[PDB]
């Protein structure tokens, strides 16, 4: 589709020129555009050319490509990757749920609760224990803890030479 | 260990063979490649101007394609969530 199609749709292939079916050679031209030849049987084709996604936002490109796959029953997979360094992930909050750890978070959580009801006197005066009780160990699922709440920001900033 | 596999130069060491053909073979894998806005527009109601200039350099712009000749997907419900941070 980066070729000047209106001038090259003739003069591409010779035997198509002989038979006179040059207007029906597969190509781009001539929100999304519905292709037609994807309705009849596809036996002598093996490759899908995908065009129109460069320059757009990531999530909309994913949504549009997946819906287009669903509408015509095509077979391929889709992933996305980034160019850069790791510490650029500062414009987003990171969280997650792993099944492998669920049975642990319960096991721990209730345990702490029990310990609360046996050292309550001294513990309800230590500020650190109250903050740790009301920030963690009081949430239903571990998925609600973001990645930034697990470490000290100042030491991490001290880890890069630029901060000095 | 999951977030570190979102980067091109580190994904490439576990799955070598990425090439650009402008599409995907039947049954293959289509890889999009994106970058932050800060790296494209290097140097081009004042408060609305400032917030627009800031948010339009945090966007993810799709820049390139590659293809792979295999699909890797098969019922676990573990996942990772990424939430855009407010300005």
């Amino acid at each position: 589709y980066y070729l000047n199609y209106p001038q090259l749709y003739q003069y591409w292939s010779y035997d198509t020129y002989r038979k006179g079916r040059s207007q029906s050679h597969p190509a781009y031209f001539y929100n999304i555009t519905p292709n037609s030849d994807l309705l009849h049987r596809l036996d002598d084709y093996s490759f899908y050319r995908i065009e129109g996604h460069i320059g757009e936002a990531n999530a909309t490109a994913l949504q549009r490509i997946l819906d287009y796959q669903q509408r015509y029953n095509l077979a391929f997979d889709v992933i996305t990757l980034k160019i850069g360094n790791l510490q650029s992930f500062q414009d987003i909050n990171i969280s997650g749920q792993f099944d492998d750890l669920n049975a642990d978070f319960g096991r721990i959580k209730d345990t702490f609760a029990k310990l609360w009801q046996r050292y309550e006197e001294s513990w309800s005066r230590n500020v650190f224990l109250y903050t740790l009780k009301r920030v963690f160990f009081d949430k239903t699922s571990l998925a609600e803890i973001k990645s930034d709440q697990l470490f000290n920001p100042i030491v991490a900033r001290a880890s890069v030479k630029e901060a000095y | 260990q999951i977030m570190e596999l979102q980067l091109f130069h580190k994904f490439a060491q576990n799955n070598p063979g990425m090439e650009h053909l402008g599409g995907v073979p039947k049954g293959g894998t289509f890889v999009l490649v994106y970058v932050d806005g800060r790296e494209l527009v290097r140097n081009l109601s004042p408060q609305e101007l400032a917030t627009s200039r800031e948010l339009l350099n945090r966007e993810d712009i799709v820049v390139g394609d590659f293809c792979l000749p295999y699909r890797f997907s098969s019922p676990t419900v573990s996942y990772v969530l990424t939430q855009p941070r407010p300005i």
Partner: peptide, 22 residues
């Protein structure tokens, strides 16, 4: 109330098992 550790553990485990089976 002595079974509450088992309560939370089994709630989480049975939820995960239920989702996979569903």
């Amino acid at each position: 109330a002595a079974d509450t550790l088992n309560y939370f553990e089994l709630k989480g485990l049975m939820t995960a098992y239920q989702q996979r089976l569903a």
